[PDB]
Amino acid sequence: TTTLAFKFRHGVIVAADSRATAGAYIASQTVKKVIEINPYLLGTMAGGAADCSFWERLLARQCRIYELRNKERISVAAASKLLANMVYQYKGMGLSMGTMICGWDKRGPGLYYVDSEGNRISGATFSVGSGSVYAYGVMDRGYSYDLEVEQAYDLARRAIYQATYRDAYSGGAVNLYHVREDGWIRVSSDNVADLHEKYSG
């Protein structure tokens, strides 16, 4: 499992693999690990899959309730704090949620890292997962806030590809998302079988 998210001049890029394992057995190669919380705010599934899915669905429910009550769309900071509080209510009970909540609000692009342990930190580059270290490597060697949209796309794809290459528990398709001022877009679902041919020449 590798997921990454980084902010740049044109939004935040979210990229994740699609492999879920039960031991050394590959349960699925088509896991949708970028949780579309709502059309203006994305989520990330890293750690316990059901935990992330359920709690980010509750986050979506609470965000939609907030939009109904207040007639204004929820901020990324508020949604991240909601998730952090909900998870912190269950500290030590075995939750294995680690998520990156992405969005664009009145404070520009927003990226937060929320985990079951209780962390909630904003940042410009995050990658959570088993293959997260291999994502940090090339993501940091390629990152610049002035990246073009295509260069950011390629950076995220290559980072997830290398993380899949090294980490045994990461693999599958490289789903990539781009959160802009008017929502997010699914740009690609490239398979590492094709990415290996693209990157090996």
Output the furthest CA–CA distance in the chain (Å, rounded): 54
Which of 1, 2, 44, 164 does the annotation list as catalytic? 1
126 Cβ partners below 8 Å, 6+ apart? 4, 5, 6, 100, 111, 113
Q: How far is the CB of 52 from other proteins (least distance, A)?
A: 8
32: burial class by Cβ within 10 Å (0-12, 13-18, 19+)? middle
The DSSP code sequence of 9-43 is TTEEEEEE---EEETTEEEES----S---BTTEE-
99 is an active site residue: no
Q: For residue 196, count other CB atoms closer than 10 A to its CB.
A: 12
152 labelled as ligand-binding?
Answer: no
Q: Which is nearer to other proteins, 144 or 148 (CB)?
A: 144
The DSSP code sequence of 118-170 is S-EEE-SEEEEETTHHHHHHHHHHH--TT--HHHHHHHHHHHHHHHHHH-TT-
Q: Which is nearer to other proteins, 69 or 141 (CB)?
A: 69
Residues within the interface to other proteins (CB under 8 A): 25, 28, 30-32, 48-51, 53-54, 57-58, 60-61, 64-65, 68-70, 75, 77-78, 81-82, 84-85, 88, 91, 93-94, 113, 115, 117-121, 123, 126, 132-133, 136
163: burial class by Cβ within 10 Å (0-12, 13-18, 19+)? buried
Q: How far is the CB of 82 from other proteins (least distance, A)?
A: 7
Q: How far is the CB of 116 from other proteins (least distance, A)?
A: 9
Q: Which is nearer to other proteins, 117 or 182 (CB)?
A: 117
Backbone angles phi, psi at 45, to 5 degrees: -105, 105
Q: How far is the CB of 149 from other proteins (least distance, A)?
A: 25
Q: Which is nearer to other proteins, 96 or 188 (CB)?
A: 96
* Positions marked catalytic: 1
Residues comprising the binding site for bortezomib?
49
Residues comprising the binding site?
49
